[PDB]
Design an enzyme around this catalytic site. Structure first.
Site, PDB file in Angstrom:
ATOM      1  N   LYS A 322      -7.615 -20.696   7.859  1.00 45.63           N
ATOM      2  CA  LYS A 322      -7.068 -19.581   7.097  1.00 45.63           C
ATOM      3  C   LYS A 322      -4.804 -19.211   7.778  1.00 45.63           C
ATOM      4  CE  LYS A 322     -10.684 -17.976   9.198  1.00 45.63           C
ATOM      5  NZ  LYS A 322     -11.735 -18.910   9.783  1.00 45.63           N
ATOM      6  N   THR A 323      -4.523 -19.318   8.804  1.00 47.18           N
ATOM      7  CA  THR A 323      -3.505 -19.499   9.200  1.00 47.18           C
ATOM      8  C   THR A 323      -2.914 -20.033   8.310  1.00 47.18           C
ATOM      9  OG1 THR A 323      -3.904 -21.843   9.969  1.00 47.18           O
ATOM     10  CG2 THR A 323      -4.484 -19.729  11.765  1.00 47.18           C
ATOM     11  N   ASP A 376      -1.167 -15.076  13.512  1.00 53.51           N
ATOM     12  CA  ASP A 376      -2.138 -15.455  13.774  1.00 53.51           C
ATOM     13  C   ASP A 376      -3.503 -15.336  14.895  1.00 53.51           C
ATOM     14  OD1 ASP A 376      -1.040 -16.813  15.602  1.00 53.51           O
ATOM     15  OD2 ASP A 376      -1.142 -18.561  14.824  1.00 53.51           O
ATOM     16  N   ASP A 377      -4.437 -15.547  15.095  1.00 50.11           N
ATOM     17  CA  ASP A 377      -5.498 -15.908  15.793  1.00 50.11           C
ATOM     18  C   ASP A 377      -6.037 -14.481  16.577  1.00 50.11           C
ATOM     19  OD1 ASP A 377      -7.069 -17.974  14.640  1.00 50.11           O
ATOM     20  OD2 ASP A 377      -4.957 -19.336  15.951  1.00 50.11           O
ATOM     21  N   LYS A 404      -0.128   1.274  10.407  1.00 45.94           N
ATOM     22  CA  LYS A 404      -0.017   2.149   9.924  1.00 45.94           C
ATOM     23  C   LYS A 404       1.298   3.398   9.527  1.00 45.94           C
ATOM     24  CE  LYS A 404      -4.067   5.953  10.638  1.00 45.94           C
ATOM     25  NZ  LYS A 404      -4.091   5.845   9.136  1.00 45.94           N
ATOM     26  N   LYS A 481     -10.720 -28.132   8.373  1.00 44.52           N
ATOM     27  CA  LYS A 481      -9.837 -28.555  10.165  1.00 44.52           C
ATOM     28  C   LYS A 481     -10.771 -29.618  10.111  1.00 44.52           C
ATOM     29  CE  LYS A 481      -8.963 -28.761  14.482  1.00 44.52           C
ATOM     30  NZ  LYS A 481      -7.123 -27.960  14.079  1.00 44.52           N
TER      31      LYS A 481
HETATM   32  N1  LIG Z   1      -6.644 -25.742   0.852  1.00 41.91           N
HETATM   33  C1  LIG Z   1      -7.398 -25.765   1.853  1.00 41.91           C
HETATM   34  N2  LIG Z   1      -8.677 -25.944   2.344  1.00 41.91           N
HETATM   35  C2  LIG Z   1      -9.017 -26.419   3.918  1.00 41.91           C
HETATM   36  N3  LIG Z   1      -8.340 -26.550   5.093  1.00 41.91           N
HETATM   37  C3  LIG Z   1      -7.181 -26.390   4.308  1.00 41.91           C
HETATM   38  C4  LIG Z   1      -6.163 -26.360   3.478  1.00 41.91           C
HETATM   39  N4  LIG Z   1      -5.251 -26.552   3.619  1.00 41.91           N
HETATM   40  C5  LIG Z   1      -4.860 -26.608   4.676  1.00 41.91           C
HETATM   41  N5  LIG Z   1      -5.883 -26.495   5.435  1.00 41.91           N
HETATM   42  C6  LIG Z   1      -5.958 -26.770   6.875  1.00 41.91           C
HETATM   43  O1  LIG Z   1      -5.752 -26.323   7.936  1.00 41.91           O
HETATM   44  C7  LIG Z   1      -5.949 -27.059   9.056  1.00 41.91           C
HETATM   45  C8  LIG Z   1      -5.804 -26.027  10.062  1.00 41.91           C
HETATM   46  O2  LIG Z   1      -6.461 -25.330  10.987  1.00 41.91           O
HETATM   47  P1  LIG Z   1      -7.220 -24.294  11.178  1.00 41.91           P
HETATM   48  O3  LIG Z   1      -6.457 -22.715  10.983  1.00 41.91           O
HETATM   49  O4  LIG Z   1      -8.651 -24.213  10.518  1.00 41.91           O
HETATM   50  O5  LIG Z   1      -7.703 -24.163  12.733  1.00 41.91           O
HETATM   51  P2  LIG Z   1      -8.394 -22.416  12.788  1.00 41.91           P
HETATM   52  O6  LIG Z   1      -8.335 -22.039  11.942  1.00 41.91           O
HETATM   53  O7  LIG Z   1      -6.621 -21.620  13.572  1.00 41.91           O
HETATM   54  O8  LIG Z   1      -8.214 -22.512  14.076  1.00 41.91           O
HETATM   55  P3  LIG Z   1     -10.009 -21.275  13.540  1.00 41.91           P
HETATM   56  O9  LIG Z   1     -11.527 -21.566  12.745  1.00 41.91           O
HETATM   57  O10 LIG Z   1     -10.286 -21.587  15.708  1.00 41.91           O
HETATM   58  O11 LIG Z   1      -9.001 -20.372  14.037  1.00 41.91           O
HETATM   59  C9  LIG Z   1      -4.566 -27.967   8.479  1.00 41.91           C
HETATM   60  O12 LIG Z   1      -5.746 -29.906   9.148  1.00 41.91           O
HETATM   61  C10 LIG Z   1      -4.557 -28.066   7.217  1.00 41.91           C
HETATM   62  O13 LIG Z   1      -4.211 -29.283   6.552  1.00 41.91           O
HETATM   63  N1  LIG Z   2      -3.505  17.121   0.765  1.00 43.22           N
HETATM   64  C1  LIG Z   2      -3.185  16.086  -0.253  1.00 43.22           C
HETATM   65  N2  LIG Z   2      -2.865  15.834  -1.615  1.00 43.22           N
HETATM   66  C2  LIG Z   2      -2.514  14.636  -1.460  1.00 43.22           C
HETATM   67  N3  LIG Z   2      -2.180  13.284  -0.707  1.00 43.22           N
HETATM   68  C3  LIG Z   2      -1.829  13.971   0.558  1.00 43.22           C
HETATM   69  C4  LIG Z   2      -2.131  14.509   0.848  1.00 43.22           C
HETATM   70  N4  LIG Z   2      -2.595  14.402   2.342  1.00 43.22           N
HETATM   71  C5  LIG Z   2      -1.778  13.292   2.719  1.00 43.22           C
HETATM   72  N5  LIG Z   2      -1.417  12.643   1.634  1.00 43.22           N
HETATM   73  C6  LIG Z   2      -1.430  11.178   1.680  1.00 43.22           C
HETATM   74  O1  LIG Z   2      -1.851  10.923   3.053  1.00 43.22           O
HETATM   75  C7  LIG Z   2      -0.768  10.232   3.047  1.00 43.22           C
HETATM   76  C8  LIG Z   2      -0.234  10.709   4.532  1.00 43.22           C
HETATM   77  O2  LIG Z   2      -1.598  10.879   5.212  1.00 43.22           O
HETATM   78  P1  LIG Z   2      -1.886  10.833   6.588  1.00 43.22           P
HETATM   79  O3  LIG Z   2      -0.751   9.151   8.103  1.00 43.22           O
HETATM   80  O4  LIG Z   2      -1.199  12.123   7.250  1.00 43.22           O
HETATM   81  O5  LIG Z   2      -3.155   9.907   7.329  1.00 43.22           O
HETATM   82  P2  LIG Z   2      -3.922  10.793   8.897  1.00 43.22           P
HETATM   83  O6  LIG Z   2      -5.108  11.934   8.462  1.00 43.22           O
HETATM   84  O7  LIG Z   2      -2.980  11.336   9.446  1.00 43.22           O
HETATM   85  O8  LIG Z   2      -4.525   9.271   8.713  1.00 43.22           O
HETATM   86  P3  LIG Z   2      -4.774   9.227  10.490  1.00 43.22           P
HETATM   87  O9  LIG Z   2      -6.391   9.789  10.302  1.00 43.22           O
HETATM   88  O10 LIG Z   2      -5.814   7.518   9.693  1.00 43.22           O
HETATM   89  O11 LIG Z   2      -3.952   8.601  10.660  1.00 43.22           O
HETATM   90  C9  LIG Z   2       1.196  10.454   2.574  1.00 43.22           C
HETATM   91  O12 LIG Z   2       1.139   9.764   1.362  1.00 43.22           O
HETATM   92  C10 LIG Z   2       0.438  12.216   1.999  1.00 43.22           C
HETATM   93  O13 LIG Z   2       0.970  11.965   0.948  1.00 43.22           O
END
Ligand SMILES: Nc1ncnc2c1ncn2[C@@H]1O[C@H](COP(=O)(O)OP(=O)(O)OP(=O)(O)O)[C@@H](O)[C@H]1O
Ligand SMILES: Nc1ncnc2c1ncn2[C@@H]1O[C@H](COP(=O)(O)OP(=O)(O)OP(=O)(O)O)[C@@H](O)[C@H]1O
Ligand SMILES: Nc1ncnc2c1ncn2[C@@H]1O[C@H](COP(=O)(O)OP(=O)(O)O)[C@@H](O)[C@H]1O
Lengths: 511, 86
Positions: A322-323, A376-377, A404, A481
């Site tokens: 995924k990295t 990552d991770d 946020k 991997k």
């Molecule tokens: N399209 C692909 N599909 C699958 N594997 C790929 C692809 N492209 C690259 N990789 C390989 O993924 C490997 C990277 O390891 P990987 O990130 O899976 O470990 P990790 O997922 O970070 O470990 P963990 O699972 O603990 O997170 C590399 O050897 C890379 O070449």
């Molecule tokens: N009454 C409303 N009508 C339309 N859009 C709204 C309204 N109130 C808030 N918004 C939109 O929601 C966004 C802001 O939400 P806000 O960050 O206040 O959520 P929050 O309740 O603080 O979220 P959290 O609880 O996850 O922190 C802005 O883009 C704002 O315009």
């Protein structure tokens, strides 16, 4: 008016210098005969903040050259701190006292004694007053401001503040009259960079060393984000190829060559390799549709005015790379700014050191226009363990507010987690905060497996015929991997025993 | 000039889009709090008040807090947010 930028020194930021000229420095360039009625006392001090390498310290001296002082004395903050209590504050006192002689001596027609602090941000931490947590250095600042706005006030002075962390400074240090006015510097636009390139070239163009096949218009824009400071080093590097050109024995661009060498403040291309061993091996539809989805919602951001921030995480079972997929999603659109945050380098750190690497990365990123950042991770840096629940609350807390946290107006970014297990996160309420998720199923089937192996080409048709004969039928569930790991383990074998080693090992995968 | 007192606007970062009236309850909320702020505005023997916004995870809570506070026309407003206390 002496403020024109046809003077070569700096460029690209014309509006900001215009502004300081507009309201800051108009009093000092105007005929005094009028103001002598009005008695308008000048700004004693100014602040300007921004990224480090954007050529702020040549602004200050340039206004000193513009309106002549005797000379600047420039200092660095850490250049004064002493273990011995008396010494540090005294130094500052010396700096100011140099002027007071002329001021009192020659009254109010004296020329400016100008001061510059390279970074204040350590010394000017905002003291706060209570029995505990008084502060370590909270007593130097008192002496400072007492010089600034103090008794026997002086009009003979000008002082420039500098920082990359404008929010830690005490609010009274900068209250009006002591330093009234603030400016922001931000990483220059392409226009500013073509100006700067005109500058550093202006001698070379005149001396005609580089006469040809050089266009600043394209060479500026091909880099969407750099610091004007690195470009001068770049030009120096561009100067180095002509001297490294005569090792063989009148100048050429090597810039297109050397841009790959340079780590920017911004995007880096040389960090992939550790993360990308093999590139992106498309074994089937899920891979390509996933990164297609990445390319899908990246455009959302770049074309959205109402959603600066967006977020996803790629979940899936472990060892599915995924990295790497996230890295490719970054690499796919040729973003201005990409960066990794990873435990590899933040290793062996406390819960508040890695936090301060992370806030560093994002506030570094906030000030770019468009960006993609990747973490990552999550499980690792969150310091999760199942046996016991144990983790650092601090990290996720400071992380999710960032999920946020909208950046300043007009700048946008997406953020990418690679978490491999999300049950914890759903329980730990990071998953409502992320916008949406991607399941990355590891390969479930052999008909896809041998296809992938054909793309790699390790195994012969017979070695592959073996697999195709024995198991078409099982659904193997495996992260890739690990696949690579054990083919390389079986790639070393007696050739006759090569293949069935792989098969036998492969049937130990679980589930 | 940003002052010691109210940010003149700093609100835009908290409200990017702006609140939209999608029905009655949005009015209900801020009218109720408007009367509440009248209560503090003219009263004796309730020098302070304490209000709380409950709601489900994304309801736009913070935004409506900013709206009510702005339309309240106070001289002095601060918002302390963890964004700054990271
Ligand atoms: N399209 C692909 N599909 C699958 N594997 C790929 C692809 N492209 C690259 N990789 C390989 O993924 C490997 C990277 O390891 P990987 O990130 O899976 O470990 P990790 O997922 O970070 O470990 P963990 O699972 O603990 O997170 C590399 O050897 C890379 O070449
Ligand atoms: N009454 C409303 N009508 C339309 N859009 C709204 C309204 N109130 C808030 N918004 C939109 O929601 C966004 C802001 O939400 P806000 O960050 O206040 O959520 P929050 O309740 O603080 O979220 P959290 O609880 O996850 O922190 C802005 O883009 C704002 O315009
Ligand atoms: N127009 C410009 N824009 C940005 N940087 C410039 C410009 N002109 C020159 N520079 C470079 O900006 C650099 C600023 O470096 P300096 O101020 O010493 O470190 P810092 O910028 O971190 O305080 C100088 O080394 C200078 O070469």
């Amino acid at each position: 008016p002496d403020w024109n930028f046809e003077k070569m020194g700096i460029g690209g930021l014309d509006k900001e210098f215009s502004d300081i000229f507009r309201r800051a420095f108009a009093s000092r360039v105007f005929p005094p005969e009028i103001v002598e009625q009005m008695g308008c006392k000048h700004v004693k001090g100014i602040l300007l903040y921004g990224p480090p390498g954007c050529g702020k310290t040549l602004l200050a001296r340039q206004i000193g050259k513009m309106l002549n002082a005797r000379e600047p004395k420039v200092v660095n903050g850490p250049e004064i701190l002493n273990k011995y209590v008396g010494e540090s504050e005294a130094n500052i006192r010396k700096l100011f006292a140099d002027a007071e002689e002329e001021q009192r001596r020659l009254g109010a027609n004296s020329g400016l004694h100008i001061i510059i602090f390279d970074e204040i941000d350590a010394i000017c931490k905002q003291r706060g007053s209570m029995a505990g947590s008084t502060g370590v250095h909270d007593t130097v600042v008192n002496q400072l401001l007492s010089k600034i706005d103090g008794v026997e006030q002086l009009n003979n002075i000008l002082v420039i503040g500098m920082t990359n962390r404008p929010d830690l400074i005490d609010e009274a240090l900068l209250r009006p009259g002591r330093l009234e006015v603030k400016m922001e510097i931000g990483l220059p636009d392409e226009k500013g960079r073509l100006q700067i390139l005109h500058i550093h070239t202006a001698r070379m163009r005149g001396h005609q060393l580089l006469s040809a096949d050089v266009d600043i218009k394209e060479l500026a824009v091909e880099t969407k984000n750099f610091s004007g400071a690195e470009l001068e080093g770049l030009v120096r590097a561009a100067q180095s190829t002509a001297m490294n050109r005569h090792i063989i024995a009148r100048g050429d661009f090597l810039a297109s060559l050397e841009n790959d060498i340079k780590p920017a403040f911004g995007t880096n291309q040389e960090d992939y390799a550790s993360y990308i061993m093999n590139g992106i091996i498309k074994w089937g539809d899920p891979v390509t549709r996933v990164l297609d989805d990445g390319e899908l919602l990246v455009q959302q951001t770049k074309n959205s005015d109402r959603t600066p921030l967006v977020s996803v995480l790629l979940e899936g079972p472990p060892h599915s790379g995924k990295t790497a997929l996230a890295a490719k999603i970054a690499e796919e659109s040729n973003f201005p700014f990409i960066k990794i945050c990873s435990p590899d380098k933040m290793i062996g750190f406390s819960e508040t050191a890695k936090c301060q690497a992370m806030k560093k990365i994002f506030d570094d990123a906030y000030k770019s226009q468009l960006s993609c950042v990747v973490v990552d991770d999550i499980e690792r840096l969150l310091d999760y363990v199942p046996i016991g629940p144990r983790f650092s609350n601090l990290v996720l807390q400071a992380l999710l507010v960032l999920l946020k946290k909208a950046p300043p107006q007009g700048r946008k970014l997406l953020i990418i987690g690679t978490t491999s297990r999300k049950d914890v996160l759903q329980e730990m309420e990071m998953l409502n905060a992320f916008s949406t998720t991607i399941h990355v199923p590891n390969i479930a089937t052999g008909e896809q497996l041998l296809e992938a192996l054909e793309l790699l080409g390790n195994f012969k048709d017979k070695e592959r015929t073996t697999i195709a004969q024995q198991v078409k039928g099982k659904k193997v569930w495996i992260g890739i991997k690990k696949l690579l790991m054990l083919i390389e383990m079986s790639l070393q074998m007696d050739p006759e025993y090569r293949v069935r080693k792989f098969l036998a090992l492969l049937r130990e995968e679980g589930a």
